[model samples]
Target: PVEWTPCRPGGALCGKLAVPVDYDRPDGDVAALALIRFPATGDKIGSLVINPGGPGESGIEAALGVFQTLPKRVHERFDLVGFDPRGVASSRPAIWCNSDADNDRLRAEPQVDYSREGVAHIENETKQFVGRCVDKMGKNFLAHVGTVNVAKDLDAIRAALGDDKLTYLGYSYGTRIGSAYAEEFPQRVRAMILDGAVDPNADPIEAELRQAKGFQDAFNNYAADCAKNAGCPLGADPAKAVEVYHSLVDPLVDPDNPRISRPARTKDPRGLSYSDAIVGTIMALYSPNLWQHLTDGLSELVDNRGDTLLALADMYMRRDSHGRYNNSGDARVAINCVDQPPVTDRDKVIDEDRRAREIAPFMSYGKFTGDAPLGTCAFWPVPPTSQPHAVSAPGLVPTVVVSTTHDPATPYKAGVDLANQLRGSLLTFDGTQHTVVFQGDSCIDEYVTAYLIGGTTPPSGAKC
Candidate 1:
């Protein structure tokens, strides 16, 4: 059972639940899952357990962020419990492959270094990176950090919390865990809300391809919005916005191009590289509330300065003034390396990168000079533990699956697919954000709160 004590200035409690590293070998090794609980403010019911955006996001940080936005009833009747999965933040036997200086060193390099001839270097670098991970975390322990283990860990967490049935919330990659949990423990779930789902049926290529096009669509939406507003950055015609954007950013790539001698200037010491500008632009496209930042970033770009764009990039990466990065970025890759199938062949890797360029030309650097290189996954030390398989949880309680219309990371249809698979009610939000819940949207919060508290599913075909 979880023993709790005051962890912060507020009435929050912090504790750890001991779970086996490998469920198959119950007594061999263990992971003390880190947990945080926001105590009930009124009539206490049971724990409403949750995980943040990642297979990597820290639950304690996410728990702190949500109390401000969650409904009053949520605070009153339930203790909001959150836990970091094995190898994630605050969890024992963590995964740390790169240092701050290592990441800083990599980001400072030219992106084309991953191009045709540059593929070999990435291959060698991935070897070193994987070696580091394998050395710090043994292969035996690392092999068990997949979604299946995480799902089992959640059940153990439920047992330790003394709950008869599980009530859960998951967002972004966390939806993968939600599906896995429902599949493995159908009878134990009382309520669940899977917001911003990752479809179980889509493979890596298809998934990334869809996301690439999705991001392009998001940019087009942002471009049109900028065109209609006062002091528009990309001009009045949204049709030619891609061309206008390319003109501003493309010069950084070609070393021989004498037309623009200097790169985009920034207030900081860092130069605005092509990749950072693109990531910055994509970051702002995630939410309509951030559209103003996109306009400002673009405006700064036109004036031959990239201060706002650089700032946006730093925000997207979660890089602070100290130049340190959160483990989520590194852990996302580590967890994914074991979750999905590896990219084995060279040809498929090249084709995947080209396809990305073909679909997301809006964000693509113009005129690819060389074959695209395979990522760290190609050199992964462990094979995938689970493949893409649809969920079929017959005895599970009715749940809600939230999907935004134009989510740049996880596309809309993916949500529809997962909802259909789990036989859950689908709540569509007509917007261009990544995830839609606890963002002050009463429409979504009402459905979710009802489902969690009373096992109430929304009416068929509900859209908000």
Candidate 2:
């Protein structure tokens, strides 16, 4: 009896829906959101809402692209919808802070004052910059942008569409969004798939540290490959790779000599900077598909070809000509700060960075993760948003969490940890990329698609 909402031409025929700026203050100022729907072709199942990762990637792009990978039957029976959560994607008042705050740029510049006498100045500068960002968005927006509110907004959209239950798919950070929903409104979920599973209980600070370690681990794999391939300077020896990597970067961070004399910046007009190489190496390792590219970038870095690594890192960090950054850093930090607590101890942070550097010498995951929160979250005026004690998803409905054994971003243990926590859920190893659904593996795909479309949960076990 319910009429389905079908996808219309001109990029999903998205409509502008006005939702409250403050859910707590519905009578207050309003914000407009973009919503797109691709309804079932035949017998309808229900509404399936999706989120593309990013406390910043456009969900609409995710929905439109990922839907084609859905099994024909599933696609035909459910409405596929994506929404631009409150401040993203054409949302009024695009969030912007300092134009040149790219971490790579920060990393690239010699510590303007990295002296024993200048320590306080540096610290104050870091704190002041963070405070300025917090000031820019003010209080109201920060308090309301947490995952909990977005989950509520999703429920409102469902109510507006009149769906009985919510079916959904979430990737990367999207996985966290889905987990929050399941934790908050378990009974409302018909079925949900959280790919690249994020453990709800893990401290954000810890996760950042682990993420850094994970990136380091993935880089180890890439370095191993580079060593194997002919003409590899590091020559396939793990220790040699480490020696080679550091011997190159050690100078750029040097107090006396900071900049890469001939840094590459094919993208940035500022030309290549050493920070570009450092951050680029971290970003390029996001996917195994870029393993070779990562090796090449590293090779260039070793050769002092800052331009190559700088260009690559610029691509990853999303730098532009006008000194404006991509929608990432500001939005990413702003949202996460409110969503979670600010890690405030500088000594503890330094200790972690020291350990990360000692353990994962070739990668800066520890340092980047450590400094980013300090650089951004410490300045956020509001404390962390209130949510459930922990992500204790009722697990009444069987949950299927997937992970790649060698995933750089989420790591494999996350899926294992999540599967164990979920009452009736099972973990499946994809042994591939970030998410398992559309990449390959007819067997895993068949099992998942069947469970989602046919309502049958797979038995719990270690099945690759």
Candidate 3:
């Protein structure tokens, strides 16, 4: 059971609950899960579970940050709750592949390199990354971190909290956990708002390409929309905006260039690498709220500086000021590798990579003609525990899914697919962002608040 005491990161109440690392073996070793909560402002309906979407993201940290922006009724009616999923931040046996020095070393390396040599370097590093995890953490540990186990953990947490049913808000990867819970513990759900839904049924390669397309479209949207505003750096011509963007960023990966040649200068020792530029730019694409930052970062790129862009890139990579990582990246791979079947066929991956670049040219590197760079999951020591399939939770309560029209990570079509899959309502936020609601949009907040409080769903095809 969870015992609450004061904690930092905005003074939230914190507690720890221990759960069997392998639920099937009830007497096996346990992992102490980290939990955080903010008490209700008024009468409490129950605990409102919140997740911020990384298979590795810290829900404990996000719950407190997001609670401030939630509608008043939600605050008055329920306790805001969050937990670090198994193997994630603050949880026992927290996943660690790279040390601080390794993280710094890797940060200097490009996240995406297309040259033949770059491809080999990425493949070798990825192998080392996966290998190091097994070297430090027992290979047996990897098998227990999948979403299936995490869902059971959630259910156990629910019972410990004495809740009859669950009230949850999940984003991105968090939505996958919600979907798993719906399928596994169907009747335990009271109300759920799964925003920026991840389609677990979507083929892994298809999901990657969809994300590639999503981010490309998001960048285009920013380019076009920003032109409507005054003094936009990309210029008023939308057509030229794309062209100028290509001209602006394409040089970071010149065919003749070394991986780090002309790296954008940053005040930090780490000058932004080509991958950082792309990732940081994509990070900005997550929300229209961050567009100005992207624009500012892009403007600095004209002068060959990488300050704002590096900051955005660091945020995406989960790196902190002291060169320490939060273990989110390592845990995400660990959880993901176990959640989906390993993609180990080299030719298959190469074909997918070719098609990806064709569909999402914005992500294509200059002469990225090398063999497909194998990901860490390709060589994961553990076998997958789940398969991709459409969810069928017939007896579960209806869930609400908020899909942004131009989400940079989760595709909007996924929202439609998931809404249909769950027999739920589709709440569309007609804008660019990763996840909507609690970002100060009254329309999204009102519907989500009403749903959480009363376990209600909007009429179908609701868009804000």
Candidate 4:
């Protein structure tokens, strides 16, 4: 049972639910998951649970943050419940690896040299980081932090909330959570909305390549849009925009290059490095609303300094102005490493990088040198507890799956695949945003509201 209390003056009710640290050995240890509930303003149908993606994002934070963005009908008909999965923020035994200072130190270091020596250094760093995680979050805890356990946690939360069936909405990596739940407990669903779906069937290399292509398309779109502006920093030619971007960013990646002399920023009055700059740009591309920020950041990078890019990078990392970062980075890596098998073989990773470069070269490179995905989870201490696979919930209630055509994080085809695999109706938003529901897309919002509230599934192949 949960003892709900006011989360704020008059905002929502907050509580904590006790779930097993290991479901298999439930009688032993317990973990507390932080939860928030926005009680229905009108008649209540049941708890409409929500999870923001990241495999690490705080669901409680998301409930407060995204509450107003949701349809009024949602507020009127169901209790909006958000819970932080185990090992995430506000949850017991929270995932922590390196301290804030150490994180800052690592991020501020020069981008890993890919030379044989550089690769060795990077590999050693990964091992050291993984070792820290294992030391901080015991191997027992790490083994149980996978999506399967999270799905079970959701069930525990549902039971604690007194809901007989799950009425849930999940976004981005949340889609993975929802799919895992449906797969594990097929008959426990009342209604579910999986937005920005991830194709559970994708392997590590395939997933990376698909995401690389998606970000590539997003960057191209941003570039084309920026090119139309008279003050376009990347220049007027859309085709040459990527080349122009490289010119501004490459020098920062290699300060030793005689052509440009700017060195990497290590400490206070921090400047952007090649990695953070690329990350900042990628983060801005997640939403069209940030296009101007992307442009402005690029302009600053070209003319003045790396301040703008550094700010964007901080935002991406959820780092506050005070140099403190939330647990998102650690949690994301922790959960992701255990959710699926990582790309470990050096040759395979290199091959995947080559494929990504062939498909989408602009956003695929690490600084100016080579194409590689960030983070090497292969060296993670805990082995994966789950792997990619299609999900199916035969005889489950009709559910809604929303997909954006140009979602950079989770590509459109991933949604199509999930919807098809689940045999659920697909609602397509022909736009470039990551997740579409409650994002001012009335069509999408209305369709989702109808399904969750009225038990109405969108028509087959529905488009917004």
Cα lDDT computed for each candidate against the true fold: 0.81, 0.66, 0.82, 0.81
Candidate order, lDDT descending:
3, 1, 4, 2
Q: Using lDDT as the measure, which candidate wins?
A: 3
Q: Put down candidate 1 lDDT per residue, 1-464, tens digits, no spaces.
A: 67887765357888888889878899988788888888788987799987876768888878877877878887787889887888776887778888877776665554654454466676777778788887777888877888888989888888988888888899988899999989999888878998888987887788889999999999889888888988777888899889888877766666654222344787688777777778788888878888888888788888878888888888777788877777777788878878888878878878888788889987766566458777778778788888877677788778899889999888999899999998889999998999968888888888887887777888999988
TM-score of each model, in listed order:
0.95, 0.85, 0.95, 0.95
Look at candidate 2 and give me any clashing residue pairs. 227-236, 263-272, 264-272, 264-306, 264-307, 265-272
Query: What is the Cα-based TM-score of model 3?
Result: 0.95
Ten-residue segment with the worst summed lDDT in candidate 2?
365-374
**Each candidate's clash count:** 0, 6, 0, 0
Please report the candidate that would top TM-score against the real structure.
3
Question: In model 1, where do residues sit more than 4 Å from their true spots?
Answer: 113-115, 257-263
Tell me the deviation in Å of residue 79 in model 1: 0.9
Q: List the residue pairs that clash in candidate 4.
A: none
lDDT of 2 by residue, 141-259 (tens): 76787887877877777776678778887887888888777777888888877778778777665676777777777778777777778877566686577677766665555435422
Where is model 3 more than 4 Å wrong at Cα? 9-11, 111-117, 257-260, 368-370
